[PDB]
Amino acid sequence: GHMVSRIEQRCIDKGMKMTDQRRVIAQVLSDSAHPDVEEVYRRATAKDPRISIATVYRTVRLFEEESILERHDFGDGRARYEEAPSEHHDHLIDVNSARVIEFTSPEIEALQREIARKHGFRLVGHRLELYGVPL
Amino acid sequence: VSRIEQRCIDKGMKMTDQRRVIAQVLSDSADHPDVEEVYRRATAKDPRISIATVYRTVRLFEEESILERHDFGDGRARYEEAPSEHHDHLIDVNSARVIEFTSPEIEALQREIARKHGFRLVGHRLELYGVPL
């Protein structure tokens, strides 16, 4: 049991497996607001002393590859990380062409709120991806 | 042939009578049994089935993605057949607990959305994130 951090939520959106080390790293990233890998590593080891710098580096790189993080050099030469932008619109994917079709459905969002409510929850986020082939 | 047994066959898994009994127990269960309930029900069918065989078999069915190990809100590992279509997920952001749900209602809207853009819907992934009221 743990709080799902904003970065962890992005990971879950991508269907990534949340191991203990990835969870710690996601939490550290969420609580930082443009750390470099050393900063992420020091903060992660403060939570789990046996997390290695290699593991931290590989994890932030994977997050970057899956567009969960963006990486930039702000001048000092260090690679620094932030939450990547997220789309407001949900997507329909044409799986044959690998093309994205944006859509918005206030109706489907109202239903998603109702589902949360029925289960005793207030909705704080959602991601829907549809997969299609042309008619 | 139980539903679980058929999954095993499709995956080319070695099947024996003891594995079939365990598969049958899982398939026939009205609740979502934990390993203790699987063992008790399996030994009632064949008393030669060991507690060790039960753990190994459920863990094998896990490793092979035929079974899903899941916390339904009681902190217990309970088992469910891996569904014909992925269940949608409502994630409690306070605990990371996943509530699996189905909504024929949302699915109808999903098909309509696909249809209006000129597509047949072939799958979806939906994650909801909530805090307890």
- Smallest CA-to-CA distance from B34 within B82, B87, B71 is with B71
Which among A68, A66, A45, A65 has a CA at the least distance from the CA of A56?
A: A45
Measured between CA atoms, the residue of chain B closest to residue A123 is B130
Q: What whole-number distance in Å separates Cα of residue A62 and Cα of residue A5?
A: 17
- Picking from B116, B8, B123, B131, the residue whose alpha carbon sits closest to that of residue B58 is B8
Nearest-Cα residue of chain B relative to residue A101: B117
Q: Could you tell me whether strands A90-94 and A121-134 are parallel, antiparallel, or unpaired per DSSP bridges?
A: parallel
> Residue A10's closest chain B neighbor by CA?
B127
CATH number given to A86-135: 3.30.1490.190
* B61 contacts B97 by C-beta, under 8 angstroms: no
Task: Look at the block and give the residue holding tokens 């949360």.
Answer: A116
| Greatest distance between any 2 Cα atoms in chain A | 54
DSSP A47: H
A41's tokens: 């590593």
C-alpha distances in Å from residue B47, one per residue of B44, B56, B57: 6, 17, 16
Interface test with B, best of A10, A93, A112 (most B CBs within 10 A): A112
Q: Which residues contact A19 (CB under 8 A, 6 or more apart)?
A: none
Q: At what angle do helices B51-63 and B3-10 cross, to 10 degrees?
A: 60
**Contact flag A12-B114 (C-beta cutoff 8 Å):** no
The CATH code that applies to domain B84-133 is 3.30.1490.190
Radius of gyration in angstroms for the set of CA atoms belonging to chain A, rounded to a whole number: 17
Interface of A with B (CB under 8 A): 1-4, 8-9, 12-13, 15, 18, 92, 94-95, 101, 103, 105, 107-108, 111-112, 115-117, 119-135
* List of E strands, B2-133: 67-70, 78-81, 88-92, 98-101, 119-132
**Cα–Cα distances in Å, from A32 out to A26, A59, B55?**
10, 16, 42
Q: Which of A126, A45, A52, A44 has the alpha carbon at shortest distance from A81?
A: A44
Q: Taking CB atoms and an 8 Å cutoff, what residues of chain B touch A4? A: 91-94, 96, 129
Q: Is A88 annotated as a binding residue?
A: yes
Q: How many CB pairs under 8 A join A and B?
A: 128
Residue A50 CA from chain centroid, whole number: 24
Is A1-85's fold the same as A86-135's? Answer: no
The arrangement of secondary structure in B1-83, i.e. its CATH architecture, is Orthogonal Bundle (1.10)
CA angle at residue B106 from B100 to B112, to 5 degrees?
145
| Resolution in units of Å | 1.9
Would you say A2 is a known binding-site residue?
no
By C-alpha distance, the chain B residue nearest A105 is: B113
Residue ranges covered by each domain of chain A: 1-85, 86-135
- Fold of domain A1-85: Arc Repressor Mutant, subunit A (1.10.10)
Burial of B20 (0-12, 13-18, 19+ CB in 10 A): middle
Q: How far apart are CA B109 and CA B71, in angstroms?
A: 29
